[PDB]
Ligand binder design. Structure first.
Ligand SMILES: OC[C@H]1O[C@H](O)[C@H](O)[C@@H](O)[C@@H]1O
Ligand SMILES: OC[C@H]1O[C@H](O)[C@H](O)[C@@H](O)[C@@H]1O
Ligand SMILES: OC[C@H]1O[C@H](O)[C@H](O)[C@@H](O)[C@@H]1O
Ligand SMILES: OC[C@H]1O[C@H](O)[C@H](O)[C@@H](O)[C@@H]1O
Ligand SMILES: OC[C@H]1O[C@H](O)[C@H](O)[C@@H](O)[C@@H]1O
Ligand SMILES: [Ca+2]
Length: 760
């Protein structure tokens, strides 16, 4: 089956820089990774790289960095003359293949992964006469480029003097060793990491600086085996040796194991018999993408996980977020459920437990960002590890989907208490006014407050700054309004917690847009989101909330309660199920009463006003900031009444609001802060699009969802081509932007293939 899907993504390339970046700093080639391994390979691009799989990509703990262009590249010699081959090279799901053809000599190479640290190359040489084999390679020298244009003349060795890359011969191949580099934002090595090449036949290896040549003579047709391993610690180096020996003793078993594992992914995954071949191929792209972003345990992360992009500037190594994980695992449930389960475990594996040394006030909290290296507060030197905030919770929805596919009640039993603790955390730490309806917010953290717990902020006016602290001081400053801007680290973290960093609803609007809004009769203070601290009975600082209750947030809490009730029932906990159903109903009632605006036929966030409205709502819907995809969150999550859903769908299907060339973007065309190139104020993301279609379908509009899905399929640029999957689209043009090989796009593209794409 895998052979029906050649070169779904262009995996050719010959990188020339360690950071061989696209215009947004992501690696501009798409290496093949499998089995959660920490290195990847590219296909040759023609004569310069033919005979090898160039572009060894190393996942150095938290980043992707190229090691070499040619490395272990084969040329074949006959009586001193190089054999002249033609090249065929292609990817399939789970393998890279290249075939070199001459009249009297042929070479067939197959590269698959064998372990979570090791790939295996079969080199089959067919020849009527003896031959001399030569393998060569060279470490990269140049540091960084942007779309082929050097960003400087810096070298790798110049930029990282301690990297100290060294190639050495070994008895059965060679190795590259690396010194310890703790470049927090660029390059992270233990000082014990290595890249090893082991072969099934003796070779004589000569090293000259950062290049090597290995030589062997064969008397005729021979098949050899080579392992490549990136090993990140001394312990990994030691453990892998026995695995390498087993692979070389049974190479055909490892090739077969990979073949079979990939046939199973395709069998389990490709279940839409009404899909066109083009639609099916998109599903295969998504499967290749998600599986390549899977990482085996490493460092502080004791589980397999999936990152947002193995090639991403800030998304690589094993960096894991909850938001991305819920979407990832929902999709992967349908083809790689073992890793879907692991990805969810990874996120909860650092869930705050009672007596925590850093944040005992946050029991049940799930960190925003976990990775190889712990934060300094937890004894590591990682700069990415983040506990300033979490992300919106679709955790129960994700856990349920894995159950829906596997029917494994022990999985539900495993996750239920963790889901409950998270649920409880939202109600203690993200409900400033105690009404059962959460806000996005932030934690107590060294970035947010002084040693004594005073909230940090910086008041900016002209070129003058003023770093102050304390909530009451902040409150005065907002009241007086004599500043150009206010930077509150905790409120920045609250924007991160929402998952939509620059959305209109959270008060983000550029100067020109705001000047227009004000010039058309609005007040600039309409765009000010007030902020508050959350304290326990005894005065303890629990964290912070926006003084605003978000309709997507409320709808995800509805969802959380809804799925918990279903899991409670599955687990024979009927009184717990009853309580969750009651909490869901209350949230639905609040969403429909408080957050729906009849006049504009849509849902919106509400402010937490100084006093609640007479009807008990915390504030009026914030209609003046315009419409966004949060407006269909009550439909996606099932909190909406039919009547309110009918009203919302009419707005979604209006070309003057959301029914754009690529439909269901992150702000309506009528939103005062709309821009077609603004990530969270116009651009279309596949998750929000799919949430929209699902919400429509849920309320009787399957036929219209199917039509929007066809529109997306026809207008979303690049969908049927061989480029990597990116993050979002211009709603007016269909143009793509974002990190290549982006997991949650892949996940929702997969869902669309499963749920909505079909032959017309
Ligand atoms: O399994 C990977 C490859 O192995 C062999 O080279 C087959 O000839 C080829 O059809 C296949 O794609
Ligand atoms: O998630 C199911 C299984 O997936 C992977 O194989 C893990 O290595 C294993 O520990 C886990 O139990
Ligand atoms: O699981 C690793 C760690 O996760 C969280 O930080 C918990 O609060 C802590 O108790 C636990 O040791
Ligand atoms: O909280 C620690 C870190 O978390 C995240 O990785 C943020 O991107 C970074 O700005 C912050 O310093
Ligand atoms: O640097 C900003 C980014 O830092 C972290 O990755 C946060 O999880 C993300 O929400 C934020 O956009
Ligand atoms: Ca509240």
């Amino acid at each position: 089956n895998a052979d029906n899907y050649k070169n779904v993504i262009n995996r050719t390339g010959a990188p020339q820089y360690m950071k061989d970046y696209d215009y947004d700093d992501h690696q501009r080639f798409n290496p093949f990774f499998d089995l959660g391994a920490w290195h990847g390979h590219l296909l040759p691009d023609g004569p310069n790289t033919m005979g090898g799989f160039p572009g060894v990509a190393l996942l150095t703990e938290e980043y992707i960095n190229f090691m070499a262009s040619n490395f272990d590249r084969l040329t074949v010699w006959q009586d001193g003359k190089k054999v002249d081959f033609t090249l065929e090279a292609y990817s399939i799901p789970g393998a890279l293949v290249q075939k070199l053809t001459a009249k009297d000599v042929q070479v067939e190479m197959t590269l698959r992964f064998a372990t979570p640290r090791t790939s295996l190359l079969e080199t089959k040489i067919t020849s009527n006469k003896p031959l001399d084999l030569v393998w060569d390679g060279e470490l990269l020298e140049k540091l960084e480029a942007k779309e082929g244009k050097p960003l400087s003349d810096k070298t790798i060795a110049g930029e990282y003097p301690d990297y100290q890359r060294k190639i050495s011969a070994t008895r059965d191949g060679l190795k590259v060793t690396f010194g310890k580099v703790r470049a927090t934002w660029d390059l992270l090595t233990s000082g014990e990491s290595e890249y090893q090449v082991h072969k099934s036949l003796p070779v004589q290896t000569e090293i000259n600086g950062n290049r090597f040549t290995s030589k062997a003579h064969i008397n005729g047709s021979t098949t050899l085996y080579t392992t490549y391993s990136h090993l990140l610690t001394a312990q990994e180096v030691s453990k892998e040796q026995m695995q390498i020996r087993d692979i070389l003793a049974r190479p055909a078993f490892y090739l077969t194991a990979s073949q079979q594992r990939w046939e199973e992914y395709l069998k389990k995954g490709l279940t839409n018999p009404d899909a066109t071949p083009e639609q099916t191929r998109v599903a295969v792209k998504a499967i290749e993408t998600l599986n390549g972003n899977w990482r085996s345990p490493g460092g502080a992360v004791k589980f397999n996980t999936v990152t947002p992009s193995v090639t991403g500037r800030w998304f690589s190594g094993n960096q894991t977020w909850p938001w991305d994980t819920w979407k990832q695992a929902f999709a992967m449930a349908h083809f790689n459920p073992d890793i879907a389960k692991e990805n969810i475990r990874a996120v909860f594996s650092w869930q705050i437990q009672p007596g925590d040394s850093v944040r005992p006030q946050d029991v049940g909290f799930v960190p925003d960002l976990i990775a190889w290296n712990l934060s300094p507060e937890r004894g590591g030197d990682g700069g990415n590890w983040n506990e300033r905030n979490t992300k919106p919770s679709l955790a129960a929805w994700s856990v349920m989907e894995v159950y829906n596919v596997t029917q494994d009640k022990t999985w539900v039993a495993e996750m239920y208490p963790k889901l409950v603790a998270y649920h409880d955390w939202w109600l203690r730490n993200r409900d400033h006014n105690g009404n059962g309806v959460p806000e996005y917010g932030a934690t107590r953290d060294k970035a947010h407050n002084t040693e004594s717990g005073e909230m940090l902020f910086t008041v900016k006016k002209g070129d003058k700054e003023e770093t102050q602290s304390g909530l009451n001081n902040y409150a005065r400053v907002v009241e007086k309004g004599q500043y150009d801007s206010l930077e509150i680290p905790a409120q920045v973290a609250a924007s991160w917690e929402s998952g939509r960093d620059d959305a209109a609803v959270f008060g983000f609007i550029d100067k020109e847009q705001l000047d227009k809004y004000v010039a058309n009769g609005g007040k600039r203070s309409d765009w000010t989101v007030k902020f508050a601290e959350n304290r326990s009975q005894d005065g303890t600082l629990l964290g912070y909330s926006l003084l605003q209750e978000s309709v997507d947030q409320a709808s995800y809490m509805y969802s959380d309660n809804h799925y918990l009730a279903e899991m409670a029932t599955i687990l024979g906990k009927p009184e717990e199920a009853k309580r969750y159903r009651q909490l869901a109903q209350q949230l639905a009632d609040y969403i429909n009463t408080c957050m729906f605006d009849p006049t504009t036929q849509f849902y919106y966030d509400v402010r937490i006003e100084d006093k609640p409205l007479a009807n008990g709502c915390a504030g009026k819907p914030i209609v003046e900031r315009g419409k966004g995809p949060e407006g269909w969150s009550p439909l996606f999550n099932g909190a909406a009444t039919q009547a309110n859903a009918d009203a919302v769908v009419k707005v979604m299907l209006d070309p003057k609001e959301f029914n754009t060339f690529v439909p269901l973007g992150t702000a309506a065309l009528t939103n005062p802060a709309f821009g077609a190139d603004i990530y969270w104020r116009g651009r279309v993301w596949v998750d929000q699009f799919w949430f929209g279609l699902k919400g429509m379908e849920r309320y009787g509009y399957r036929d219209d969802a199917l039509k929007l899905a066809d529109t997306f399929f026809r207008h979303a640029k690049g969908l049927t081509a061989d480029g990597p999957i990116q993050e979002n689209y211009n709603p007016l043009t269909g143009a793509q932007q974002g990190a290549p090989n982006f997991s949650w796009s892949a996940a929702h593209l997969y869902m669309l293939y499963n749920d909505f794409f079909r032959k017309q």
